[PDB]
């Protein structure tokens, strides 16, 4: 051993319960040296006061499951992601996956950092007023970097990899299943930075906040026949979440969204999160 | 006993007396990757004496009608020291850090800061006031350098989210009472196991008054603040020619 | 190969607003940025602001804002700039260009060249 | 704003002879976002030169130029006039990126 200095911890670990926690009798107490009510804040740490040792209690048993506030059964409730109409003039459309451009939904999914989950996508397709016809359709899903269609009858409708999903519009709705899909470990709903090199100048500043890790190419459909259809369509999109993990809690938003892609708000009119009273002696 | 605490990691010392206790953020500790996770074939390198130690960067002045201010990591640490050599030269990185944050004062002062740590603070804009406005903030506001950059909209955090439950991040108080020094340790947090260091930042740090500053005229009005960091288990790897920015 | 088309010349009175939009083809639309340069009779070529069509984020020039604002639609492969409060001094040649990547951000394609003139 | 005075503005030389063609910016700027630009009587401009020294393909290997700081410069030198044109040159180190004042050329 010729150099001595070249040969040279977890708090808590996760438990199981299935129900709230129960109340142990108590009595009163004086003395001094133990205090429990008296805590302190700048530690950053809550305080850890229960009931007995503030006020007198009684035993109770209760059996309150805690099964509800998991995050499988908070995330497992489809949501509606997209609108997409058909009235576009040229019996196709193209729609760029971007599913944050409905509040409810975007609102749930921004509580965390990270998310790495399983997917479950509904169509439900009618005419504008709801009017259902016999309709043959095609829905075909381009991954990234393949050629996208530009015509009713180009070449990319072959589908020879693609997956497609073959309907009529009086069917049930189509239901499929898609994987954790992202090169990375997780999705991220927040990047912070530029995903390019170089110097940044003005022309740099429309990039902030691009992760490429999240982008998963377009969506088409379109009508399976050559010629004109007589009949306008319009797809409504709804998603289920299965198999959530979740990393880091974040602040919930309280100013209305403007734009789908960045945390930009209307800097006029900023909403006091609260509703106001007039004296703050009575309610 | 406990109110007295010393910090010594590298060549460096920090000592203080009215100190609350250490904040380990989400309970874990800061490591080297391990080979289940890593991905990148090359061997990294580990200087850990250079690079292991307290950085000090510019101060700041508390007013009596101050907002805030927010620092970027680790932006802060890309310009100084040999962290500042390595981060350019290597394309890969992976670190945790240990933010150490200073202001004292007198018995006769009174205030309170609250300093929390936010990973991906991604900012936002006014939309031009009306909200019709697809704008963008510039390089100087999302990459302020060491010195950082002051709030405009405190409330909100320019970023829309409200202040009133920013505690749900790792944070502690300075109360000018008690206190006078507050401390996190920060592991390194991401979805990859490395990534660029001039490319992408890690966590942001807030430093916000949420009760104002207030002292008797007479008294001394010149009240500082001084923010210390350490990275802790740095490595990089991808070796390169150097890239500025 | 790749080319820039614009619109034909729109006269309209002064005080009205009118739409100028260009169109490409030929090559992949979010790839690149856009760019809008006008050129008065004078004076140099004037630069209005760049957009992004991924996502919209948009720029102007701080003689310009408020005068011309930016859009884009990802689906059909087009951009249009639509010009409100139109003075008689706005009569001019107002061109659209791409940005180039191996280049150190040059212009290297531009359009047509759409022109507007504002009388009564 | 950041000012170009391209200087002459005008010109007129024989085939074989040297156009010597200055931009002088009021700040010392970075030379590689430096451009050049060629418009083409009635028609849409195109680049010339980039990194200020470099050209795009379909152009001939006769124009060139060298300059930092303050004064910068373009020189051709040859015989052919089928290329008469207004020539404007274009920084972009700064925001917004400006064009010059302008320079065309006339043929004996």
């Known amino acids: 051993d010729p150099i001595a200095d070249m040969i040279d911890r977890s708090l808590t670990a996760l438990q199981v319960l299935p129900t709230a926690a129960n109340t142990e009798a108590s009595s009163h107490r004086l003395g001094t040296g133990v205090v429990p009510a008296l805590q302190a804040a700048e530690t950053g740490a809550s305080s850890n006061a229960s009931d007995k040792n503030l006020i007198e209690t009684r035993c109770v048993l209760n059996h309150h499951s805690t099964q509800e506030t998991a995050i499988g059964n908070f995330f497992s409730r489809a949501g509606l992601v997209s609108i997409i109409t058909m009235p576009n003039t040229d019996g196709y459309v193209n729609w760029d996956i971007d599913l944050m451009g409905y509040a409810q939904l975007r609102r749930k999914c921004e509580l965390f950092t990270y998310m790495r989950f399983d997917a479950e996508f509904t169509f439900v397709v009618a005419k504008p007023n709801g009017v259902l016809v016999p309709q043959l359709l095609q829905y075909m899903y381009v991954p990234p970097g393949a050629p996208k269609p530009t015509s009713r009858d180009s070449f990319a409708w072959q589908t020879a990899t693609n997956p497609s999903v073959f309907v009529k519009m009086t069917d049930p709705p189509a239901q499929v299943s898609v994987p954790f899909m992202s090169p990375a470990s997780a999705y991220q709903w927040f990047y912070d930075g530029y995903p390019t090199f170089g110097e940044h100048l003005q022309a740099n500043d429309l990039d902030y906040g691009q992760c490429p890790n999240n982008m998963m190419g377009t969506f088409s459909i379109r009508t399976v026949g050559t010629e004109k259809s007589p009949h306008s369509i319009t797809l409504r999109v709804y998603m289920r979440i299965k198999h959530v993990r979740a990393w880091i809690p974040r602040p919930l938003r309280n100013q209305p969204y403007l734009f789908k892609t960045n945390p930009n708000y209307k800097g006029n009119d900023i909403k006091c999160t609260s509703t106001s009273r007039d004296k703050i002696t009575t309610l | 006993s406990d109110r007295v605490a010393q910090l010594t990691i590298g060549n460096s010392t920090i000592t203080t007396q009215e100190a609350a206790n250490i904040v380990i953020a989400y309970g874990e500790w800061p490591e080297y990757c391990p080979d289940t996770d890593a991905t990148a074939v090359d061997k990294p390198t580990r200087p850990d004496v250079s690079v292991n130690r307290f950085f000090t960067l510019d101060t700041k002045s508390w007013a009596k009608d101050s907002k805030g201010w927010y620092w970027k990591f680790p932006d802060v640490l890309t310009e100084v020291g040999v962290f500042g050599q390595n981060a350019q030269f290597h394309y890969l990185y992976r670190s945790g850090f240990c933010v150490h944050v200073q202001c004292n004062a007198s018995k006769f002062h009174q205030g309170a800061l609250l300093v929390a740590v936010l990973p991906e603070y991604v900012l936002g804009t006014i939309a031009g006031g009306t909200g019709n406005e697809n704008s963008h903030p510039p390089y100087a506001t999302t990459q302020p350098g060491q010195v950082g950059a002051v709030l405009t909209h405190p409330y909100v955090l320019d970023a829309g989210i409200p202040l009133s439950q920013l505690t749900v991040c790792p944070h502690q108080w300075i109360n000018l009472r008690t206190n006078n020094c507050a401390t996190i340790i920060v592991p390194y947090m991401n979805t990859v196991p490395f990534d660029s260091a001039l490319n992408h930042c890690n966590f942001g740090l807030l430093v916000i008054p949420v009760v104002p500053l207030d002292f008797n005229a007479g008294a001394t009005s010149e009240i500082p603040i001084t923010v210390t960091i350490a990275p802790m288990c740095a490595e990089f790897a991808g070796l390169r020619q150097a890239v500025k920015q | 190969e790749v080319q820039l088309q614009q619109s034909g010349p729109e006269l309209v009175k002064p005080g009205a607003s009118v739409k100028m939009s260009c169109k490409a083809s030929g090559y992949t639309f979010t790839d690149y940025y856009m760019k809008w340069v006008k050129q008065s009779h004078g004076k140099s070529l004037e630069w209005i602001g760049d957009?992004?069509?991924?996502?919209?984020?948009?720029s102007y020039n701080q003689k310009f804002k408020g005068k011309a604002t930016l859009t884009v639609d990802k689906s059909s492969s087009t951009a249009y700039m639509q010009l409100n409060s139109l003075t008689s001094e706005d009569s001019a040649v107002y061109y659209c260009?791409?940005?180039?990547?191996?280049?150190?951000?040059?212009?290297?394609?531009w359009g047509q060249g759409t022109s507007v003139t504002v009388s009564s | 704003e950041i000012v170009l005075t391209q200087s002459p503005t005008t010109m007129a030389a024989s085939p074989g002879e040297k156009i010597t063609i200055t931009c002088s910016a009021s700040?010392?700027?970075?030379?590689?976002?430096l451009h050049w630009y060629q418009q083409k009587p009635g028609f849409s401009p195109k680049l010339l030169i980039y990194?200020?020294?470099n050209l795009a393909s379909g152009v001939p290997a006769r124009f060139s130029g060298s300059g930092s700081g303050t004064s910068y410069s373009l020189t051709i030198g040859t015989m052919e006039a089928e290329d008469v044109a207004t020539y404007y040159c274009q920084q972009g180190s700064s925001i917004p990126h400006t064009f010059g004042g302008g320079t065309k050329l006339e043929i004996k």
């Open positions: 957009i992004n069509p991924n996502n919209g984020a948009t």
């Open positions: 990194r200020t020294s």
């Open positions: 260009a791409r940005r180039g990547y191996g280049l150190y951000y040059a212009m290297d394609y």
């Open positions: 700040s010392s700027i970075s030379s590689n976002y």
